[PDB]
Amino acid sequence: MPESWVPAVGLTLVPSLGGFMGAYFVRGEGLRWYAGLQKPSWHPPRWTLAPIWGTLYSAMGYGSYIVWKELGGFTEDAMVPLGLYTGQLALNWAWPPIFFGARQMGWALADLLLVSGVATATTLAWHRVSPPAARLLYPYLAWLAFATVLNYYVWRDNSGRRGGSRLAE
């Protein structure tokens, strides 16, 4: 009978499966690919970075607690946000199934997916009822820009600043 919010805890652990198995692809396939193309793979390995969910998890637990504490603890009213968030995030953020497309520049689907999944879902789910929590998450945008910018960098790395001549003589 955990003292902390059982819902927020488990539901917050859910993204741990999609985020773990998700990035698990770049964990090895990424470290290697870097040997071929130029990638910012120099950033601390998922070992030190992956803790992204650890920090956001702490803030999450806090926000959640507030949301439910407002509408009145965890009730049928809290099941709509928490749930709609778990379900929407599951099928929507479920980006690990793109392993097949992870070998293509489309690999960006990861960032775009998880970014809009937790962000969008939390906007209509949590921020919709409790605006204060949204502030505890606010510092999560940096993370969104982290992955998002990552992919953007790769693209411009192998293909950027285009506009030259052809053959001519």
Answer for the pair 89, 14: CB distance below 8 angstroms, yes or no. yes
The residue written with tokens 């509408």 in the block is 71
DSSP state of 29: I
Q: Which stretch binds ligand PKA (CB under 6 A): 1-9, 54-62, 107-115, 127-135?
A: 107-115
What distance in Å separates the CA atoms of residue 28 and residue 146, rounded to the nearest whole number? 19
| Residue 60 Cβ vs ligand PKA, minimum distance, rounded to whole Å | 15
Would you count residue 113 as binding ligand PKA (CB under 6 A)? no
Full DSSP string of 45-81: -HHHHTTHHHHHHHHHHHHHHHHHHHHSSSSHHHHHH
From 8, 11, 89, 114, residue interacting with ligand PKA (rule: CB under 6 A)? 114
Would you count residue 117 as binding ligand PKA (CB under 6 A)? no
| Residue 134 Cβ vs ligand PKA, minimum distance, rounded to whole Å | 21
| Cα-Cα-Cα-Cα dihedral sign, residues 26, 32, 38, 42 | positive
Would you count residue 43 as binding ligand PKA (CB under 6 A)? yes
Q: Which 46-75 residues touch ligand PKA, going by CB under 6 A?
A: 46, 49-50
Secondary structure E strands in 68-128:
none
Q: Which residues bind ligand PKA (CB under 6 A)?
A: 19, 22-23, 26, 30, 41, 43, 46, 49-50, 107, 110-111, 114, 147, 150-151
